Amino acid sequence: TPPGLQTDCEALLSRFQETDSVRFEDFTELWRNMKFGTIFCGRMRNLEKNMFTKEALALAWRYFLPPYTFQIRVGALYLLYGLYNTQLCQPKQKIRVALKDWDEVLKFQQDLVNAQHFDAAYIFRKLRLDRAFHFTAMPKLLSYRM
């Protein structure tokens, strides 16, 4: 896992924990004050930057699991959204997903439908239309040679 990016994501989630629930006003305030889209290209080897963004998105989606309040979950999901929409890497790295995670997000969409946390279904639907999710069995790659 990416060490520094893990700490950055945890700090952003801690800030979203004190922000409003799902209100996009606080997400804009965060993007303004701290700019969680901190670094994408800088100046580094092409494949190094590529794997940097890859591990970023992978760890973010892995952290995006079911248990957390409506703050942490939304924060992780829309951190992923922003990282994908501000993709400065030439390839648009797809967000790594799990098989049952699709049914999980479908149940989340159903909850949004039978709820009124507005703009959340909107951002998630835009992300889906953007063709960003690529699903697998494990949030990372695994072997037996380690």
Added chain:
Amino acid sequence: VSGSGGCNFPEYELPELNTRAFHVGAFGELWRGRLRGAGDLSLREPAADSDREDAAVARDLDCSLEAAAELRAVCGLDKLKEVIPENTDLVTLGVRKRFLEHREETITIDRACRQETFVYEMESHAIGKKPENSADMIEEGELILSVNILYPVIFHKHKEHKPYQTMLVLGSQKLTQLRDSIRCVSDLQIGGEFSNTPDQAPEHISKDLYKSAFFYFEGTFYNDKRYPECRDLSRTIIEWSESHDRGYGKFQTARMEDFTFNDLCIKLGFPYLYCHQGDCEHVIVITDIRLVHHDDCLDRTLYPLLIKKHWLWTRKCFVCKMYTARWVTNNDSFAPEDPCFFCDVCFRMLHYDSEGNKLGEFLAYPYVDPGTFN
């Protein structure tokens, strides 16, 4: 024989090691069923635009632009941070600056990234390539499986293990294609003694002679029956496994030209076998199962292009140390060592006189260096 009864979801069995048994064809079928797809075409956009999205939201749950009109403006690039990443309280930027300093110390310009550029080019080789024929277009939702292979012993048993190539395979395609695509050195290897006749062209290579090959996945033996010269080592394997109550249950036998990747029952992260040429065994590790995408290779003809290829060091001629060896000599007096190695010119000028007569007694064989594919 039917597949092992199990849920399509790959429920875990060992922490961060591997999941339980499951089917592949039903996996892909349920994967395509639980969503609509119709997005692997790259037709987002290259005028009336508001009414179309209005009608779209009208079928959606909100049927209003109140939130969309604000969120589409918020989620833009004109309000996004080229510039030096500094002057802000950060955490990873410290590690970034430390890496920049370590680079400026010894790393010179932008290079020495051999494996990095290898991965880059091997991934770009499959970006938006179209098939030659219109009938070769990969349909949406096709299963793509990533499969690492560990054939060889010649590598770093110390470096966490990075022995050999990784392949991508399509579900609907047959396993015989993967069999024929695995680039094994033993297939190019050639047997026979050619000390007296060095100029004789080696004929009937091991690939053509030893056509015996078979896969082994979860106690299922897939034996190739495409050629009339293929034997059945699974026969002796089953004989051994059944001659004594060693705890191994009955194993099923099937053909390789009738079972595809879909009909297999595998465990992601579990080692399976691919044994050919008698003792040439490959440890097969199917790691990931994913669907096709417009960014991936959409041409069914060249899918098994590897996503990874391990570098291998060629054996240099022991005499001149300038050319790669092509002949291996045993019991050679003129040779400095017993497991010796010579190239064409050195072997000719050392082991033969001005007319070509065999100087001295020795045993020479065509040394097919492992670094022949790359």
Added chain:
Amino acid sequence: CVVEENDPIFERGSTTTYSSFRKNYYSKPWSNKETDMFFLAISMVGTDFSMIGQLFPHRARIEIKNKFKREEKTNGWRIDKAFQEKRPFDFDFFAHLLQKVLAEEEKRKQK
């Protein structure tokens, strides 16, 4: 019926077997403080092993007899001094010392 209650043993090679001659005894050694309090109990009681075994619950009377024979065979002056000295029989303080020895062996096992 035995519902997989026991496991088969792959023992007793039909070829042959040998003897052991040593089965059960497997005594346990003493310590310095234990030898001291044992000499104290000797001085306090005498040579009657019944009372010594009754007051020693955690050590066997056969082991006590073996220890007394070993002392008689090796250290005679110590037995002579023990029989010279005498102490009235104490019960409550002896039980307190027994509890202390239990705590000491517990600490030993912990170490």
Added chain:
Amino acid sequence: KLFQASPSVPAKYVEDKEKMLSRTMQLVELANETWLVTGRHPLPVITAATFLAWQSLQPADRLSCSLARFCKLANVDLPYPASSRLQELLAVLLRMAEQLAWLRVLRLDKRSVVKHIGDLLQHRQSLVRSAFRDLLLPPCMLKSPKRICPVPPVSTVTGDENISDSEIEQYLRTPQEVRDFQRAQA
């Protein structure tokens, strides 16, 4: 069962019967002539000898095999003193190696003398002769027995007929101790 290749035991452990039996016979004769079987159980020595023979017939593949491993492979109850007998026989073999010329220069040990055990039995006569020139007894007796069987001081002091009655009185149990014993054994 190291004679016929069975399913469990691979072919590497299988060895010849006649040669291994002859080697074991030579080894146990050496043990009997070097005072190793006298006073001790013979079967542990036989086991150690056959194990050494099985290891010497092919030291390469069997340098890592242990006594317990060999017993498990052969399905034989491991004797307890077999290990001590093996350690003593290997010490005798090291002495024979020191007696020999090339081996004492090689400076072998209890792990590398197994490959030359065979050579030690070729001329073991003169080797054992010289070893005895330069008796096998238990380790508890070869620890420099300076004072062998110390002479105890003769004490035949008998007095006239007795000593006194103070000892009788100190042997007699007091009423307090009698009552204490009665209370204890009540």
Added chain:
Amino acid sequence: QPSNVLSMAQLRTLPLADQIKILMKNVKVMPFANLMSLLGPSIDSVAVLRGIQKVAMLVQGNWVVKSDILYPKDSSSPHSGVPAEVLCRGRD
């Protein structure tokens, strides 16, 4: 559910290599056309050639089984008991 223990059906049920090996060990003299006719027309001529070149030699246009195929390394002469290597050398 002699070397001719296997019948024609049991032979055909074996791989082409084993079929050719057994046919050569049994007959020791047979033309390539006769071998093809016995094996069947559905088998490839190149395959039959590759199978026979490893267990037979060409003598005056005909195919003769190799000596080692008839006399394994652990076998011996049934009349004199000499090793199989000498028999192979003599047959060669």
Added chain:
Amino acid sequence: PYFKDKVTGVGPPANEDTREKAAQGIKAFEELLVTKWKNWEKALLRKSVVSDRLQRLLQPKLLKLEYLHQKQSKVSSELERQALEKQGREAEKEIQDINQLPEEALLGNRLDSHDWEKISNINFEGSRSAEEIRKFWQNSEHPSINKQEWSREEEERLQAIAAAHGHLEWQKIAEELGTSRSAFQCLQKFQQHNKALKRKEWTEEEDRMLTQLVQEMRVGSHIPYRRIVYYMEGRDSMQLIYRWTKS
């Protein structure tokens, strides 16, 4: 990692294809591997050779002494007992002189008869092949080899001696050099000092062949210059790099 999925390694059966591979002679890269030699391995080789030589020299003497002892124990004559004792003392003095001989002559000449397979399977536990041990003892483990590096007075002579010999023979080159070294080391140093044969100069056909290589087997920007050299004998790495990298 492990590479024994199917057959754990307890009862792996040698099948028909396996025995055919073993009997044909297709030794791809497994047994031809070579491992660097170690100092303790050198010491073990020297000790084993010395011990084998001393044992083969003493075994006849030991058998003769045993025969003399048997004659003593079986012959009851006193007149011949003096001669028997004299011969026994003579054999003892012979053994004493053999043991007193310094440890310089008991190693043997460069080409002497020994039991390489025996020494290997006894001492090296089969890790080192008999032929490899023979070569290592014949050209790399002899006290008569000149360990001193070339004093810039051997290459100029060898470039002519080997040229006259046409590289057709092994021992004659070293014998004509006469510096008490091995032909292996001599040829190695000579070919490391000299340059390639320099096939040709800017041939358009070879340039287009290299271009086809860079188009068929190249990945990204890195170029396998060793793959380039393999299909083109008579070149050198540094010059080929500096030349092909430009123009």
